């Protein structure tokens, strides 16, 4: 324009670049945006019911294949016969089986004691897990109503009760809508109120990583701001270990001896698992916990294999390389791999030869190979989300856990490159300078390989840090049953006798803004953590002393009732303004609205006790010319206090002069108006 | 010289714009690339095959 020969075009270039910088950051936020694992819920074999009871199985190298279910009506005498090929016999004589299958809380989830007998056990441990994956991600499970949040559940349709043409007595129309894989992801979105893509995918034993991949690819784009991705296989009938045994694919002892010379086949188990997932710059902007980031995912069918159940050796290399070129990484960044490790004698040699071809390509540091199926058995469709719970507790515990049955590494694989180090021992895995990435791979019977690359959470240096010890807030307990509320203060009590000195403010933040406002409420506000331990033990027995118990029906709607006269004491709020500036300042606006209409101000009145109010020209109560405005000022400041603490009235009602305060707080009369 | 900054900072603007015209038609193909229906097979109620 004027100076030199550039003052205008160099503004359109600045803009064409900050538009190119902001349009090529939109391409990397739509196909490669990290998807944070906000929380994990998991009920796995071996009594595992939470991913801190799941690390207490991997870290001690405990196998959870311990025997067939007894409480499930299984015919444990017709499942076994000396003949290897009978028609109804099963070859797995063990396996990882949970007792949480024949167990559910119908009343909590709003289903009748007849609609729930018909709920497939794969739907009843997805509703329970959906409540937990949210109650441990912070997000109140009842706060996600009409919120875009996809439920992506992986399920191998399994057969529960009477055939749909043989309807029961109470379970009749609800036998198809409680068992259809359709309504496992759908029951969750209904009970939780979610309005997002509630898709129940089915890709055999990769339906958890496919559901995780289908949720990550539903997030990178944006159709659901949040997403519950996971999968469950709880086997109601012994109909899967009696068919898988008919193709002689099972092991006679139920162990998935991964990458081991004793490999017999799958050690088929049953389990669940759910991940709460959100775009990394949506779980940092909302403060949600970020446990690990799912960098990239890939799904790749085996193609024309040598059998439907037969694995492809060059369709896994193209899925370990699609998830490795969609995450923007390379084969040398992934420290460890949670491989399938089915324990098969022709699927493990093919898996690992696909792992010396996509990862073990001149590896400077050996790849730490493992499988969670070794610890719990093949959890089928829950495997792949039980590998992103194994390699997300491996992120956050600084340790690669064991592969429990692989000391005698199989002789059908070539472990000569020294590029893969099967995890026969707990390998330390601390936070170094290079990000800690892992790979979880689930390949299925249908021939749909899936591979997901996990990375450790970006090191949060400060985040929500420390401030100063001050007034303590109520410890907010609530449950949907009077016997479940005793169990809440029988599990928070333990979560503090196991973890003592836990900041009270932190047990009143993630209990109040971390849980749902369920009917049976027992909040309380102690002196400290150890003072609350007393009330916790009292509520375990139902004895409320120091605890504020109550009952509700999702009630809300408080009413500010305003007494006119007769509620004054000699020291009304003497320290209520000395402890918080939300009452002192609340008094300040009333005072400056009372100064032009009153001489003596309210500030020194409630500041001083009656024993010291006798010398400030303001009697304790008899001065109706002074205490009536004081009453109104105390009243309005207190009402503003409850409003500042989130207590808003559905109605204000005043008695005689509390009418003035009610009008002041209702908005019909200004602060100065009602003050005058 | 190159017509100082008249034929240069304007030569970099036909790249930073022609790259913006190709990094925005990648976003219109990552979100709204219209997919075809190349063929349709149906076995539906009745004689439909």
């Amino acid at each position, epitope marked *: 324009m*004027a100076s030199t020969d550039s003052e*205008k*075009v160099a503004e*359109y270039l600045r803009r064409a670049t900050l538009d190119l910088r902001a*349009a090529r950051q939109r391409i990397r936020e739509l196909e490669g945006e990290p998807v944070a694992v906000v929380a994990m819920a998991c009920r796995l074999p071996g009594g595992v019911s939470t991913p801190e009871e799941f690390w207490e199985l991997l870290s001690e190298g405990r196998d959870a294949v311990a025997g067939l279910p007894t409480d499930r009506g299984w015919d444990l005498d017709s499942l076994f016969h000396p003949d290897p090929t009978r028609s109804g016999t099963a070859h797995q004589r063990g396996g990882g089986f949970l007792t949480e299958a024949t167990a559910f809380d119908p009343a909590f989830f709003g289903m009748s004691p007849r609609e729930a007998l018909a709920v497939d056990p794969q739907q009843r441990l997805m509703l329970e897990l959906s409540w937990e994956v949210l109650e441990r991600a912070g997000i109140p499970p009842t706060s996600l109503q009409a919120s875009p949040t996809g439920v992506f559940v992986g399920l191998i349709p399994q057969e529960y009760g009477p055939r749909l043409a043989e309807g029961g007595e109470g379970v009749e129309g609800y036998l198809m809508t409680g068992t259809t894989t359709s309504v496992a992801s759908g029951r969750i979105a209904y009970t939780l109120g979610l309005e997002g893509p509630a898709i129940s995918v089915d890709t055999a034993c990769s339906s958890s990583l496919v559901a995780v991949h289908l949720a990550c690819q539903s997030l990178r784009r944006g159709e659901s701001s949040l997403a519950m991705a996971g999968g469950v296989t709880v086997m109601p009938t012994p109909g899967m270990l009696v068919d898988f045994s008919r193709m002689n694919s099972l092991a006679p002892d139920g162990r998935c001896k991964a990458f081991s010379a004793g490999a017999n086949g799958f050690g088929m188990a049953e389990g669940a698992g759910m991940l709460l997932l959100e775009r990394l710059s949506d779980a940092r902007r909302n403060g949600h916990p970020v446990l690990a980031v799912l960098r990239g995912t890939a799904v790749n069918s085996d193609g024309a294999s040598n059998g439907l159940s037969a694995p492809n050796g060059r369709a896994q290399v193209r899925v370990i390389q699609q998830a490795l070129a969609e995450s923007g990484l390379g084969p040398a960044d992934i420290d460890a791999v949670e491989a399938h490790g089915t324990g098969t004698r022709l699927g493990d040699p093919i898996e690992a030869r696909a792992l010396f071809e996509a990862y073990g390509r001149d590896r400077e540091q050996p790849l730490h190979l493992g499988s969670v199926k070794s610890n719990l058995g093949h959890t089928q469709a829950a495997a792949g989300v039980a590998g992103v719970i194994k390699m997300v507790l491996a992120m956050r515990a600084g340790t690669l856990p064991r592969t429990l049955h692989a000391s005698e590494r199989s002789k059908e694989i070539d472990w000569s490159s020294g590029a893969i180090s099967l995890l026969d021992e707990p390998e330390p895995w601390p936070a170094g300078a290079r990000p800690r990435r892992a790979g979880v791979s689930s390949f299925g019977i249908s021939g749909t390989n899936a591979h997901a690359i996990i990375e450790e959470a970006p090191q949060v240096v400060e985040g929500e840090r420390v401030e100063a010890g001050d007034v303590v807030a109520p410890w907010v307990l609530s449950a949907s049953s009077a016997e479940g509320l005793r169990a809440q203060a029988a599990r928070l009590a333990a979560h503090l006798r196991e973890h003592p000195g836990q900041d009270p403010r932190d047990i009143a933040y993630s209990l109040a803004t971390g849980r749902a406002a369920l009917p049976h409420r027992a909040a309380f506000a102690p002196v400290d953590e150890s003072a609350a331990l007393r009330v916790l033990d009292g509520l375990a027995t139902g004895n409320a002393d120091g605890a504020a118990v109550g009952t509700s029906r999702a009630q809300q709607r408080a009413v500010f009732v305003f007494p006119g006269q007769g509620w004054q004491w000699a020291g009304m709020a003497v320290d209520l303004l000395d402890t918080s500036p939300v009452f002192a300042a609340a008094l300040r606006e009333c005072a400056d609205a009372l100064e032009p209409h009153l001489d003596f101000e309210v500030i020194p009145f409630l500041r001083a006790e009656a024993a010291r109010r006798e010398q400030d020209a303001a009697l304790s109560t008899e001065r109706v010319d002074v205490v009536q405005p004081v009453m109104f000022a105390v009243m309005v400041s207190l009402a503003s206090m409850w409003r500042a603490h989130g207590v808003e009235p559905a109605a204000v009602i005043g008695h005689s002069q509390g009418e003035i305060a009610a009008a002041c707080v209702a908005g019909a009369l200004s602060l100065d108006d009602a003050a005058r | 010289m190159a017509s100082t900054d008249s034929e240069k900072v304007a030569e970099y603007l*036909r790249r930073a714009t022609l790259d913006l015209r190709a990094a925005r038609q990648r976003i*219109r193909e990552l979100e709204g690339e219209p997919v075809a229906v190349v063929a349709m097979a149906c076995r539906l109620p009745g004689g439909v095959s």
Partner: antibody, heavy 118, light 114 residues
Framework: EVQLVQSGGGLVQPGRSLRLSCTAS????????MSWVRQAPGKGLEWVGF??????????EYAASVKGRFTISRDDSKSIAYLQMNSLKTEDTAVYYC?????????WGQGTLVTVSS | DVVMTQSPLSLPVTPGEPASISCRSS???????????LDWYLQKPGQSPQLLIY???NRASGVPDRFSGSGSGTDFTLKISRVEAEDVGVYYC??????????FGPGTKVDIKR
């Protein structure tokens, strides 16, 4: 983000001195050439002036309507643009904006309502 | 001299219907670089003016894809592919060839059409 948040409106009598501050946070303040566009109540935008970048000289170009009256400055270490409005008359009752471009107005800020009434 | 730019000052838009504001310049805004020096600004009613288009056809980031840009050296056009309830206001055709520009133009007074 870039946010050009402004401050400094108010009520004065014709012939006063008023300061208009443009807080720039999100971009390198010294690269752009901030400008101040006036919009009298309910009519079209009129451009008051703009300071060149410190690297472009810092020459300040003003309008014909406000030459010898207004002066515009900028600081990087304190990262603020200034419209120094001296000898105001009745015309300055308006919503003054601060855009981040001499020929390519960008963020525009928010809108500082300045009023010059007697 | 100065570039005099005019437009359909009182253009009505009905929601969901493509609309088209046009600009006509007396002089030629196609500078030698082959880049037009016309910009399209939007002042939404009672808000800070927005930059919709720079260099005639290029759209600023953060601006809805609806606003499309085109034009020769004299006649120009803004093609809103989809007018919604935020697409209403004043659309200023503002040149860049001859800085300084004391005015942003009369601006196209856009209205929801009935």
């Amino acid at each position: 983000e870039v946010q050009l948040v402004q401050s400094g409106g108010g009520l004065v009598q014709p012939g006063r001195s008023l300061r208009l501050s443009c807080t720039a946070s999100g971009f390198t303040f010294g690269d752009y050439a901030m400008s101040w566009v006036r919009q009298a109540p309910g009519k079209g935008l009129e451009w008051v002036g703009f300071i060149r970048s410190k690297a472009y000289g810092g020459t300040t170009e003003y309008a014909a309507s406000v030459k010898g009256r207004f002066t515009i400055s900028r600081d990087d270490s304190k990262s603020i643009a200034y419209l120094q409005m001296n000898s105001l008359k009745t015309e300055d009752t308006a919503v003054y904006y601060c855009t981040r471009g001499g020929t390519l107005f960008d963020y525009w800020g928010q809108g500082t309502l300045v009023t010059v009434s007697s | 001299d100065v570039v005099m730019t005019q437009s359909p000052l009182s253009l009505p838009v009905t929601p969901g219907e493509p609309a088209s504001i046009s600009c006509r310049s007396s002089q030629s805004l196609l500078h030698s670089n082959g880049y037009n020096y016309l910009d399209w600004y939007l002042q939404k009613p009672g808000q800070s003016p927005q930059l919709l288009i720079y260099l005639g056809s290029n759209r600023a980031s953060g601006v809805p894809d609806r606003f499309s840009g085109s034009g020769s050296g004299t006649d120009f056009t803004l093609k809103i592919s989809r007018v919604e309830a935020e697409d209403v206001g004043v659309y200023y055709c503002m040149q860049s060839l001859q800085t300084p520009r004391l005015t942003f133009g009369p601006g196209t007074k856009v209205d929801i059409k009935r």
